[PDB]
Ligand SMILES: CCCCCCCCCCCC(=O)SCCNC(=O)CCNC(=O)[C@H](O)C(C)(C)COP(=O)(O)OP(=O)(O)OC[C@@H]1O[C@@H](n2cnc3c(N)ncnc32)[C@H](O)[C@@H]1OP(=O)(O)O
């Protein structure tokens with residue numbers, strides 16, 4: 274008999290940079306209301322959204338992901354050659370196959386590197402970040418790209434009074450690699466598969482394919498149900514993430530929850546009992562909810578405005594579809 | 608400034624068990640030959656396939672994954688309560704969201720546990736396995752389910768003379784957890800994004816959705832290119848996985864390549880230069896190509912026939928869409 278080798282990589286792993294891509298076209302609340310009975314004022318006070326970006330027709334979750342990666346690499350002072358793997362997290366790659374990751378890799382000039390697509394609603398970034406961290410620590414890679422990307426706008430039913438003003442397009446990537454001190458806390462994650470219907474595609478693609486004369490699929494949302502779940506449960510998730518990371522709530526400088534809704538997030542702020550001067554991500558204002566892309570996009574907004582600084586202690590909480598959640602403490606990149 | 612804490616999991620991780628779900632309906636080559644100009648003889652000698660199983664209309668990738676997990680749990684002497692996380696790998700979950708994993712978790716009676724969907728063509732399993740091992744060793748979980756599942760049959764163009772006889776339905780899961788001795792070698796993985804068109808959905812869902820009554824999407828395949836790529840490249844992949852695991856080719860007792868084609872796989876046998884008596888998975892004979900699910904399904908097939916024993920040193924090689932590949936040495940479960 275023989276033994277399978279026991280291996281390990283670098284223990285200390287961190288975020289080296291963030292890179293954000295936001296589509297050109299700006300969509301105002303007045304524009305969104307062109308098919309629903311609503312107002313700009315209502316939408317804003319209910320969601321915290323003022324505007325959002327929609328990508329062009331020639332753009333995709335993969336294409337925006339690539340731009341986001343190019344930017345993250347630039348901000349890290351690295352090239353494609355430095356990366357060992359890419360995990361794409363998204364809910365809007367509109368192909369059963371091929372995966373987006375290998376495509377992104379080839380467009381970056383690193384066609385050979387490992388990679389896969391990971392889906393878990395808005396929690397995808399948290400799961401993907403944790404996954405890169407585990408892999409790097411396990412020695413399966415030294416440096417990786419983790420990119421959240423979303424082209425949600427083609428899934429929106431403009432007549433849906435419950436959600437048409439919520440979702441938007443964009444991508445953001447983080448470079449993950451070895452750092453002098455631990456930059457990514459342990460992953461806290463879970464789900465509620467009993468509420469799988471709360472955020473969904475209503476009609477599966479095959480069903481749609483077989484009945485073209487029926488309705489087409491759209492994103493459907495049980496808003497209040499999600500609101501209750503998130504505002505009620507994400508305080509404990511955050512607490513477990515900070516506990517695993519061995520940091521107190523008073524030590525958090527930056528709160529970056531998934532940008533689902535500003536009312537939920539400000540509720541989670543009070544709940545987590547961060548300190549008064551704690552910086553709270555509000556990228557939802559002109560970005561809207563970009564699911565898997567929301568957290569890294571928000572990290573980038575906090576950094577480009579200087580509201581957050583490199584090295585700040587941050588709490589990331591992703592929550593959403595399937596009813597999935599993932600959270601971790603991290604040191605801000607760049 | 609406080610340093611972020613690091614959590615720790617198991618050092619030795621293994622496959623405790625495997626469970627296989629195979630759909631009731633058997634589709635013979637002659638049945639496939641009702642819509643293409645071919646013969647049973649041709650298909651068999653060119654692919655190694657005699658028959659394949661197709662799932663019922665009311666079955667899905669998530670539902671077969673669930674049955675597969677239940678059996679895997681049963682074969683390990685465990686219940687849902689013992690599982691900390693589930694990763695569903697598939698290419699045929701026909702919803703952008705919610706993800707399959709939380710749904711499967713809830714059907715199993717463990718609705719809270721962490722989980723996500725992983726897509727990487729047929730290499731999904733290897734990536735999913737590698738990720739589960741990384742998370743367990745990293746201490747994000749102690750015991751996990753990794754389930755490969757595929758309902759490919761509704762994506763087949765029955766008139767496509769190049770592929771209609773290749774893909775099939777089924778699911779199989781492994782229980783992954785701590786073992787006395789190292790049961791899972793290091794992941795060796797990569798891709799070839801320049802050949803993303805080799806195996807693909809021809810029409811993306813959104814384009815299709817905006818012209819439903821026109822042509823619908825189907826799985827398309829540049830077979831000779833894939834054949835060439837796999838037979839020429841997977842020998843070195845295997846060799847890297849074995850070198851990583853610190854094992855010699857003469858020490859492998861069981862070869863389990865992705866069941867894409869029996870001609871490719873037998874070429875890889877000669878290429879890797881395994882010993883004469885080494886057991887080679889040939890589940891493809893009556894299972895067909897089940898992508899993400901093929902390796903676990905084939906593992907299960909070898910064990911139920913006694914051709915393989917639990918504890919045998921196995922080389923797993925997954926290759927397919929996006930042009931992705933993942934390989935590792937492991938000890939057989941159950
Ligand atoms: C291609 C397919 C692929 C589809 C698949 C695409 C992939 C998707 C991937 C998603 C991945 C994720 O998980 S992303 C993260 C998920 N996050 C979220 O969904 C955000 C969380 N959502 C929320 O918190 C909520 O939606 C709120 C609070 C923002 C929305 O509040 P609300 O639900 O509108 O409030 P409520 O009044 O109770 O709701 C009912 C309605 O609002 C009222 N209303 C609306 N506007 C007005 C108004 N101006 N004046 C008075 N009332 C108004 C209407 O009566 C309307 O009726 P009616 O509505 O009853 O008709």
Ligand SMILES: CCCCCCCCCCCC(=O)SCCNC(=O)CCNC(=O)[C@H](O)C(C)(C)COP(=O)(O)OP(=O)(O)OC[C@H]1O[C@@H](n2cnc3c(N)ncnc32)[C@H](O)[C@@H]1OP(=O)(O)O
Pocket residue numbers: 369370643644645646649650653654698699727728729730759761762768769770773806807808809824825826827828829830831833834867868896898899926927928
């Ligand atoms: C909703 C959408 C989502 C869709 C998305 C669904 C998700 C998919 C997920 C996939 C995930 C994976 O990675 S799965 C792993 C992928 N694996 C594979 O694809 C398996 C590898 N493939 C192969 O080995 C190949 O396909 C072969 C060798 C089986 C096919 O060879 P081939 O068909 O002979 O190729 P070709 O050179 O075109 O043949 C040329 C000529 O040969 C003869 N010929 C060809 N076929 C036949 C025939 N059946 N019977 C008699 N003769 C024939 C003819 O004279 C023909 O005519 P003429 O040309 O002279 O006129």
